[PDB]
Structure formats: C-alpha cells, structure tokens
Design a protein around this ligand. Sequence first.
Ligand SMILES: NC(=O)c1ccc[n+]([C@@H]2O[C@H](COP(=O)([O-])OP(=O)(O)OC[C@H]3O[C@@H](n4cnc5c(N)ncnc54)[C@H](O)[C@@H]3O)[C@@H](O)[C@H]2O)c1
Ligand SMILES: NC(=O)c1ccc[n+]([C@@H]2O[C@H](COP(=O)([O-])OP(=O)(O)OC[C@H]3O[C@@H](n4cnc5c(N)ncnc54)[C@H](O)[C@@H]3O)[C@@H](O)[C@H]2O)c1
Ligand SMILES: [K+]
Ligand SMILES: [K+]
Ligand SMILES: [Zn+2]
Ligand SMILES: [Zn+2]
Ligand SMILES: [Zn+2]
Ligand SMILES: [Zn+2]
Lengths: 373, 373
Amino acid sequence: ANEVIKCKAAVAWEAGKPLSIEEIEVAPPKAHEVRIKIIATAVCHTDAYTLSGADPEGCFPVILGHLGAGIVESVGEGVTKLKAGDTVIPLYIPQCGECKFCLNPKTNLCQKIRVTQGKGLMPDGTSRFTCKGKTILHYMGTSTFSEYTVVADISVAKIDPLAPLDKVCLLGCGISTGYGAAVNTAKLEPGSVCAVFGLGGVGLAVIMGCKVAGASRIIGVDINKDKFARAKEFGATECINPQDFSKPIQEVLIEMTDGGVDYSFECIGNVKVMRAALEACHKGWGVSVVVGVAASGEEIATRPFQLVTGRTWKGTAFGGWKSVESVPKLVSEYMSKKIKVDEFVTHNLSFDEINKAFELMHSGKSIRTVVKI
Amino acid sequence: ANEVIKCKAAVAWEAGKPLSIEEIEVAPPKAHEVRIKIIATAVCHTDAYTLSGADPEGCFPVILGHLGAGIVESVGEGVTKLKAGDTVIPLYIPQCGECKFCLNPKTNLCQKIRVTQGKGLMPDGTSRFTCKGKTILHYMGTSTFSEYTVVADISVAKIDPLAPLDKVCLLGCGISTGYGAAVNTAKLEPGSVCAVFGLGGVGLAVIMGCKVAGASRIIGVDINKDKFARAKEFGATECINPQDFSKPIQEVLIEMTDGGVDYSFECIGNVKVMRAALEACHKGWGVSVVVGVAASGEEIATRPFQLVTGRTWKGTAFGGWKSVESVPKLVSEYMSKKIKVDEFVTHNLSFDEINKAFELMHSGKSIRTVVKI
Ligand SMILES: NC(=O)c1ccc[n+]([C@@H]2O[C@H](COP(=O)([O-])OP(=O)(O)OC[C@H]3O[C@@H](n4cnc5c(N)ncnc54)[C@H](O)[C@@H]3O)[C@@H](O)[C@H]2O)c1
Ligand SMILES: NC(=O)c1ccc[n+]([C@@H]2O[C@H](COP(=O)([O-])OP(=O)(O)OC[C@H]3O[C@@H](n4cnc5c(N)ncnc54)[C@H](O)[C@@H]3O)[C@@H](O)[C@H]2O)c1
Ligand SMILES: [K+]
Ligand SMILES: [K+]
Ligand SMILES: [Zn+2]
Ligand SMILES: [Zn+2]
Ligand SMILES: [Zn+2]
Ligand SMILES: [Zn+2]
C-alpha cells in the first residue's frame, strides 16, 4: 500500500528569502493523482517572480518548481493509463481531454483544475505536503523542488523511457514555449523574416523554431551582447543591441527589413518592448507574438492604426501545445535530433545548491541550470 | 480631343466650414489617368474627420469624397483596359498589381501612388482641379464630391454596366469594409459566436458578413436602441445596450456567452470600446477586429495577459479586398442578391444638399444617405 513518504524538498517559507532545504512528508496519491519521483529539475523566472513576493497571487509556505522529469512512484484510485515505473514530465498546463478547451483545436488551456491549482492545492482542495507540522502548498500543479511530488493525473506526460531526464526536464516550460510560439502560434512559413527580442532560453527556443520552420532572416535583439554568440549558433542571421542606436528599436528593424519583419517575438516580459515588437512588424501582414509574461498591472499599448493597417497581435502559453499529447512528441523530436535541448544547459548543480541556480539566473550569466535531485 | 470641363463640385475651402457648391474646372486626363462622371456619392466619417480640421494630414482647399459610382468620361494616353462609357467605382485603395503589396496575397495595401495621393495630387505631382483661379486638392485619390473627377488608372474598378449607381456607390467604403472584416479578416467559421460593437452601416455590414459566414449567434451592441430593429433584420440574434448594465460591457458579453465571443468587431472608432471588444473575446481562441480607420492620436491598451491567454487583436481598413479585382465581384454579389446594399439607404438628397448628409450622419438619424449629383 502507498505510504507517506519522508523526503527532502526546497521549501519557500516566505517571500524574499532563500529556499530552505527541509525534510518533509509527502502523502500518498488520492483518487486520480500521481506521485512522482523527481530526478531532475530546473529554475525559471516564474519561480523567482513568485519567490520574490512580487507576484500578487503568490502564497506561502510553498514548494516551487515547474520544470522537472521523473518516474512514477505510485498512482491513486482510478488511474489506469499510468503506473509505477513510467517515465514522465509533470505539466503546469494539463490536458483532461474532455473540457471545452481540450476539445477545441485552437487552444491548449485546459480549465479542469485551474482554480485549485491557482490556490496551490490538488483537485480535491487539499495539499499533499507537510513540514514541521505545517501544510505546505503546491505550485503550478507540479512542485518539482522535491524528491517526490504529487500531481493531478491529467498533469502528466508519459515519455520515451530512454530519454535523459537531466535534459528533458527543460521541455517542461521554456524550450517548448519558444519552439511552439514559432510553429504553433505564429505558424511562420518558409522564407519568413523574423525578429526575436530577448535572447535567453525562451528567445533561443523561438530562434530554433524559426529555423525548423525555414525562416530566411532571423534577427536577434538583446541589450546584452554576450548573448549574441549562442543566438547565432541557434540560427540567428544577425543580432543587434538597442543600446547601439539612438532611434527606437522598431525604427531600426523597419529600416533593416525595408518595411518591418513578417513575425516578431517578445521573449522578455517588458511592455515597452512588446509595443516595439508589434510596431517593428511589416505593414499589411506583420504578426507579433508576446511570449514573455509582464508584471501584474502593466499594460501594453499602441495606436489602433497599427492593427488597422495590417498588423496582428498574439500571445502564447506554453507554446500552444496540448500538453499530454504533445510533450511526448517533443521528447521524441529531441531524441531524433529534430530539436535541441542539451545546448540550453549552461550549468549543473546538486539539489542542496538550488539557491545558486536562482542567483545565476539573476546575474544573466546562464541560460538554463539543471538541478540534480 | 479631351477638353477642360467646367462643372460644379462641393469645395471645402477651409477646415470647420460647410462644403460650398462652386463652379470649377476639371483638366483632361494625362497619361494613365481616367476622368469620371460621378453619378452618385455618399459621405463617410473619414470625410467629416478631414473637414473638421482635426485630421493632422488635412489640407485645404480640397474636394472630398471617396464613396462614388460613375461612368468613364475619357481616358489619358496609355490607358487601354478602360474606355469612355465604362461603368466604374473609384478606389481610395488602388491596385497596380506590381508593387510589393499587390504581389503579396496577404494584403491589399498598394503603395504605388500613396505619396502623391496623401498630398492630394495625381501621380505626376499636380492637381486637375481649379476654382476661381486657385488650385484645389484631390482627396483619397477619388474626390467624388464633384460632377467630374480625375483619378489614377489604378484607382478604378470596372463594374457590371447594369448596376444601379445610386446604390453601389456605397460599396466604395463602409459596406465592403464591414463585410470583408467578417469574411476576410476574421474569416469566421460556421457556428461562430460573434459580437458587433456599433450598429451603423459598418456594423450592419459586419453582421451581414457573419450571417453569410454562418454564425450561430450575432450579438449587436449599441447605446442607441433605435438601431436594434435594422440590426436584427440584417441577422443579429440579440441586441444589447451597454447603458442597461452596471458592469463593463466585456463582462456582460462574457456572461451571456459562457466565456466570451469567438469573434468581436469594433465598428465605432472608440479606443475604450476597442479594448472592451478584445476582452469580450473567449479565452484561448477569441479574435477581435478593429473595423475601419479611426482618428489618430489615441492609443488602445490592455494587459498582455489577454493575448498570452489566447486572444488575438487585428484590424482592417477596407475589408481586405484587393480593390480592382474584388470590388467588381462585390457588385456582382449584390446583383445576385448574395449581399445587400439597398437596405443601407435610409435617405436620398440632391447635390446642393450635401451638407445635410453630414448633419444626418452626426445626428445618428441615418445609416447611409445617397447624394444624387
Ligand atoms: N508564455 C509562456 O508560456 C512563457 C513560458 C516561459 C517563460 N515565460 C517568459 O519568457 C520570458 C523570458 O524567459 P527566459 O528564461 O528566456 O529569460 P532570460 O532572463 O534568460 O532572458 C531574457 C533576456 O531578455 C534580455 N533583455 C532584457 N531587457 C531587454 C531589452 N530591453 N531589450 C532586449 N533584450 C532585453 C535579457 O538580457 C536576457 O537576455 C520571461 O518573461 C518568462 O517569464 C513565458
Ligand atoms: N474620425 C474618423 O476617422 C472616424 C470617426 C468615427 C468613426 N470612425 C469609423 O466610423 C466607422 C463606423 O461608421 P458608421 O457609418 O457605421 O458610423 P455610425 O456613426 O453610423 O455608427 C456608429 C455607431 O456606434 C454607436 N456607438 C457609439 N458609441 C458607442 C458606445 N460607446 N458603445 C456602443 N455603441 C456606440 C453609435 O450609436 C452608432 O450607432 C468605423 O469604421 C469607425 O472606425 C472614424
Ligand atoms: K502564419
Ligand atoms: K478564422
Ligand atoms: Zn516557466
Ligand atoms: Zn481540459
Ligand atoms: Zn470611408
Ligand atoms: Zn500596388
């Protein structure tokens, strides 16, 4: 019988402070839940945003983390598609396959468990984590900063048993988001002229997608020139630094492309750049995709003339991938070398050093850091 | 040979003043120009915008008007596809068929003569209008408020010679814009749930297009309930007045559609309503179209979360129709009764009462007023 598990986890007792390595208890999975042994995890800006306390919806104490790969340790009642030993990736965007969103080909935003998930709880309204006599909340329905986590059975992607978990955990968010922004949201055509604002992991993934799609010109934009080299390796035909020009960045791009780009992607989360990305698009057919998540309250703006004269403004969540059915396919594309993952890993750390992963992220010295549990 | 023509035209001597019927002189057409006898015309908010003096680009004196239908009186050298007697509709959006925009199937914004057209001149850099010894400017490459006008040969659509000119002159802007916003810009699918903000001529044309496309629900929105009857005649399944509700109109629409509409169209020119129209769209797949050119200056805004979670923002000025090739097809659709035009005409006036057409438009008493030259 499934017993309570005593293991290590990185707990955020309060905002603005380092994660605390603690000994916690993980309850067995209830009906339609899956307990996963996390093998590898990584840190994302979203985790840091919540940890800083700047996130209006952030609640503590909580076990953060939404990028992970592992093995099913046990399943609850009613679970038949998954079993102990299955190789999996936890998903913050689930796929129940029965709601109006899952049934609609135009979206991947399953709403089946969003309410409880937003509160850091399992679908039944409770948490499976406890530490020092306190209930600890879940995060983004995944909580990967633990040796063991429990997730809703619709938040699990079963993947290739041969996949290297110390690499594919990155497909949990960033890589899939950027890649999908190109092939799913923008659906750019061969020969397309593109501009990518922000050359971090997300921007590099967008570039990767543009390349797969057959883009002719891919202009990388970043205020940190140290990001240009890798952007080039991923496919950027050239890179520019907004700081090297007096004119607004959109005017520079328009001049370079004789009118503007066919597709632009904002991978920073800056509302001013999001406007710039839209205005950098070509009149008549340009399309700009917001990939970055801006801070609460901030608004994007532009003159309606921009839309009336042909430009389209879009956005994407997890690259538009129907999670449960698509993540396994993404793993397979990586295994077959259609897409890259290893090239995103710039650092490797042990679980006890998880806080250093956040630090490296602030310094802008890394792309992705994989934490070995 | 083609001689100078002495006729009457409604001249706008200065911003903020009524139009004046004056005796003017119209020069014969030069190379690649066409002189047209205008039979019927109509006024548009755009003409009024320029006339008010609010348009930063407006210059005087000028002969306004861009909605008309007439007969070719004569053609200049080099013109072979058109001849005296041809039934035509002048176009403010030309189609040279050779520029970057004409060659791209995703747009209809021909740029061949935009520079001179913006200055109220023919492609050769001069005007064909004079009045009392003064040069009078052209407008939107059409200047339909004259018994005779001269336009670039790429600004002419040759139509069915049996078409009633006192009706099809309306296809010169609004009707084509609204109809096209539905079938070209939005490309809504059968069964779609739509919302149309503004029930004037443009909004009615959008409704007409949604019905042609097979929409399951078409919710008309207007603060003037007197516009509801005709909206339902055109196909609206429901009509709502924002003033009847205490909460924001987007919240109202979301509630009556269990999440929001599949497509929304803003046909008012109000930036606040444009934002409402976007936010009224369904999460994951909603699309909002800003219909028609609005007044420059004000910006539209929203939180990027709206786009990241699936909504798309678009716009259109002329409904996306490649002008020279499609306007004749629209006339044919009217002749075959696929689309309506007669139903838009609520008033008829003589040329010397042209100012009353402006008054009727601003009072909200009319949908479309046809002015007989
Ligand atoms: N929509 C989604 O589903 C989705 C998924 C994952 C990540 N996010 C968002 O994507 C964004 C990027 O993630 P990341 O891991 O690549 O972050 P990152 O910090 O590693 O990369 C951001 C890059 O933007 C560059 N940058 C910052 N300001 C700039 C400016 N003004 N002009 C040009 N470049 C500038 C930075 O130098 C850095 O290279 C964040 O907002 C993240 O939250 C969204
Ligand atoms: N200066 C300009 O360029 C200018 C000015 C106004 C409108 N626009 C264009 O005019 C076109 C509309 O043309 P039309 O002939 O149909 O105009 P119209 O004036 O006949 O119709 C506009 C309708 O909007 C309704 N309306 C106004 N404010 C409302 C609100 N807050 N909420 C809901 N309904 C409201 C009005 O009652 C009217 O029925 C649009 O394409 C718009 O972009 C341009
Ligand atoms: K596309
Ligand atoms: K569509
Ligand atoms: Zn993330
Ligand atoms: Zn679902
Ligand atoms: Zn008009
Ligand atoms: Zn052209």
